Paper text:
The crystal structure of a catalytically active fragment of TcPINK1 was solved and refined to 2.78 Å using E. coli expression of a cDNA construct encompassing the kinase domain and CTE (Ser150 - Asp570), and possessing mutations to reduce surface entropy (Glu527Ala and Lys528Ala), a 10 amino acid deletion in a large loop (Δ261–270), and a phospho-mimetic mutation (Ser205Glu). The N-lobe of the TcPINK1 kinase domain contains three insertions: Lys182–Pro192 (Ins1), Glu221–Ala253 (Ins2), and Leu260–Met288 (Ins3) and in contrast to hPINK1, Ins1 exists as a loop remnant in TcPINK1. Ins2 forms a small domain containing a βi-strand (222-226) and an αi-helix (231-242) followed by a loop (243-253). Ins3 is disordered and is not included in the final model. Finally, the majority of the TcPINK1 CTE (Ala487–Leu556) is α-helical in nature, and rather than forming a separate domain, is tightly packed on the E, G and H α-helices of the C-lobe of the kinase domain (3747 Å2 buried surface area), supporting previous data on the importance of this region for catalysis. Although TcPINK1 was crystallised without ATP, the kinase domain appears to adopt an active, closed conformation, based on the positioning of the αC helix, activation segment conformation, and the ‘in’ position of the DFG motif. Ser207 phosphorylation was also observed in the crystal structure. Inspection of the structure revealed that Glu205 (the phosphomimetic of Ser205) lies only 4 Å away from the tail (Asn287) of the disordered Ins3. Instead the TcPINK1 structure reveals that a highly conserved aspartate (Asp381) within the activation loop, an arginine residue (Arg336) of the HRD motif and an arginine residue (Arg216) in the αC-helix, form an equivalent interaction, which is further stabilized via interaction with basic residues (Lys212 on the αC-helix; Arg240 and Arg241 in Ins2) and another conserved aspartate (Asp366).
Author numbering:
A (entry chain E), B (entry chain D), C (entry chain F): 156 to 182, 191 to 260, 271 to 274, 287 to 494, 496 to 515, 536 to 566
């Protein structure tokens, strides 16, 4: 594992009362985030959990000292998120003192070029926007498959690699508000109103903000990130996020008719996908796995599958998947497809095909 | 760094829908400007950038919370303006809630006595006017040297310290419209017509207002504040700003013959400087570094340098600069001279000498 | 707050070089006055102060842009006039561009049916005239109570709602000459002769016109609207305004014997009030609060209070006030009484009683 001794720091990227991010390299394409006071004596469990959660995507842990019982319990209760092109790259996590220049938690990450809101200050291609949506959906599908909910998706913390600015790579980052417990997965008992519910923010899903507490009384997050993707899809196709601003829809009120129409540039099928995602009732919304397939099928299927027409065969699908595997053996395009093939199960690709047919 | 806890508020100085300014002190010579809704959820990026830009002259930043990515990207993309006597003193910037009596941006500043248009409600000395012009020029020279353009210079936001009312201290304030980006400096790609171009106002320079958009198609701001100084110099010598009023010259139209002649009370050399600054073509206008020098030389050079006569020697110039440093080791007079010595490069003081000789 | 987006224009009511008034409605009972060139760059402060003053009765302010320093200085020096039935209803004031069809000032007001001079083109009932006079007085008592002087009261800008033409509602309008400063209230330093003194017009009170300038040398406006009311009372009871016409008394000369006698139709008590109001010396004039009570007592007191007789008791007064409060729980009649009860203090209702007794 990489620790401090293997790397050289540069200029600060950000400084704060609660921590610092430094540029870094091995001997400046890395960022080393340091969160101070990772110590049960200097902070309560709520804050330590939040610091640890940031570590949910991490590739390796390293520890100098004997782990404290609270550290142990945190680790043993946590679902791990495997690597994925659309999830932030966190290469190492270690604990360490403020020598080597407060017990401090350290995270070594890839440096990204900008966030999504910055990249959208200039309107991208309509094709670029579909790739962005596709990657965002693919990241959400990967989290949900592994019983994790981000709970704080927003423009601000989707991070981009803008080599080839016509098609960037998008990653989900900042897992400090995430749900990742082995015990309860994506369903969370909600008994007191003063309980951690994710980011108490604009893009919390209606099924989370609206829920009243009680005795199970559960909060279900299995489609909650998807709702926020819907909002975010607006920003991705050049419009205001309907739920941001001074004249501003709210997750708990909004009637589905209040939602602005999307520009005519953005395909009809995709408009429907966005409208699906933004359904208040989670039962009415697509599975993440299926919603991701919709975007991929739009991007890569035979055109006959997309036009009303249409004979779809189980054997023909598998042939088409294999044509795709050979096609990748335009770096984003490769990533999406491999990402798509990694999870393609025959059932769900038909579900997505059937959904597309019904929306024309 | 100073935060709210260290200071005590008094009467409001200004009250508005978008923010409030309060008189303040440490334990009422400070002003604490508060701008509401410094939140990506309650306002769009263009408004937030405009709030942050106001911060460009700040001496210290302090943050309670962990910086959001937009805040980080803003901070890292921004050119900083070092302290300077003719630039507004902003001692602290901090982010904070509307308690402590909306996430609000806060600016702790010096309180100044009035603006330039109020001070010029009674005609000042002709000597006072030259000190005013020198200070303004010296401020613009400092901005331009650091790749920053104010874009909204005007009587209304030039602020004065009127202890010793025969000679006040002038400062440039209200950096809300400024250009201060590390990436592009003073050259700004102008691709869409619906783009922030600075204050879309009377004293935008001809080279900015007249430029049509395209594909680079660049806006060059490197002499644009200087044009505004020219217009403002009229107000400073007791005339109407040629570009203000109902019967009014317009930056885009005006031909150089349309400009009113200045009063005979204003030295001939200074009349020419003003006529230079107000040239339509930025290539015909002096560098800021040179234009500031013209005013300084008028003020402090040996009289032989100013009369037609005149042997000027590289060694003699340096001797004269060193005579000045000793002379400052009438507080405005000290500040201007030290301001001038700080930036004096030998090339530019000769250029300024040569320019004065050619205009008599 | 209401802005342009909330309302739909109709026909112009008036057009000019300096601005426009449009009929308007929310989705034509409103008027939207627009004054152009509300910009320090297109007009001098004098003209802006006069545009801003028009806004003194306004119920809400709204500003799209960051307020300029001259705007700020205006707002913070200005006394606000709370709503009142006899003061023009201005629902919103906002600043905006001349697009959306010049920075322009916008005032959204109630439409009224006519002015006083038009309404008096046919002689009204002697009872109608007392209601008019009472409302006028009530408006003045409200202004003086909040340290504001209109300084341009005249038939031309008293505006009427003429539903139930037997009894109309009168409002004082057009506050563009008014004195409304926090600093000095109704006493105004008068150091130069070229100083804004209100409408420099026929109904300026003798104490204002006759005052020579100096070093305090103060103009006292506390009984000055009252004087104009006196003149206007003639118009209200079917006579020529003594101070209007080609054969014409002047506010600086007129001897109190020169005032025409009022018609025998107008009560003797009311003749005396008018004569009191038109006394040259403001110290011999009734307080506005008392003068307004005189008219009210005439209209609503027990008849025994008005005839020479008369036992008046502090407890009995209060009982009578409460009898009035019940009587209002003929819409003008309601308004007058509520207006009178809102301000009735026991001291001043006895002062008025006492004054009525001494004038028979
Ligand atoms: Mg041990
Ligand atoms: Mg966090
Ligand atoms: Mg501003």
């Amino acid at each position: 594992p990489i620790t401090l001794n293997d790397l050289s720091l540069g200029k600060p990227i950000a400084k704060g009362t609660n921590g610092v991010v430094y540029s870094a390299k091995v001997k400046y394409p890395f960022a080393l985030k340091m969160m101070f006071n990772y110590d049960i004596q200097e902070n309560s469990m709520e804050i330590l959990k939040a610091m640890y959660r940031e570590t949910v995507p991490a590739r390796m842990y390293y520890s100098n000292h004997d782990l404290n019982n609270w550290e142990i319990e945190l680790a043993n209760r946590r679902k791990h998120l495997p690597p994925h092109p659309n999830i932030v790259a966190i290469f190492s996590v270690f604990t360490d003192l403020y020598p080597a220049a407060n017990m401090s938690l350290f995270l070594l990450m890839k440096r990204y070029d900008c966030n999504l809101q910055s990249f959208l200050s200039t309107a991208p291609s309509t094709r670029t926007s579909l790739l962005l949506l596709a990657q965002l959906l693919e990241g959400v599908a990967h989290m949900t498959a592994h019983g994790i909910a981000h709970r704080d998706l927003k423009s601000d913390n989707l991070l981009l690699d803008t080599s080839e600015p016509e098609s960037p790579i998008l990653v989900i980052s900042d897992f400090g508000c995430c749900l990742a417990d082995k015990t309860n997965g994506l369903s969370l008992p909600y008994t007191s109103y003063e309980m951690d519910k994710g980011g108490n923010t604009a893009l919390m899903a209606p099924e989370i903000i609206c829920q009243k507490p009680g005795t199970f009384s559960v909060l279900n997050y299995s489609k909650a990130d998807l709702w926020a993707v819907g909002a975010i899809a607006y920003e991705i196709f050049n419009c205001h996020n309907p739920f941001y601003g001074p004249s501003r829809l709210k997750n708990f009120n909004y009637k589905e008719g209040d939602l602005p129409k999307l520009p005519d540039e953005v395909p009809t099928v995709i408009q429907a996908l966005v409208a699906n995602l933004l359904k208040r009732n989670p039962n009415k919304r697509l599975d993440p796995e299926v919603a991701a397939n919709v975007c991929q099928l739009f991007l890569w299927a035979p055109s006959t599958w997309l036009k009303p027409g249409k004979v779809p065969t189980s054997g023909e699908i598998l042939q088409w998947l294999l044509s795709l595997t050979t096609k990748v053996l335009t770096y984003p395009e490769y990533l999406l497809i491999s990402s798509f093939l990694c999870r393609a199960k025959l059932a769900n690709v038909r579900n997505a095909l059937h959904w597309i047919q019904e929306n024309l």
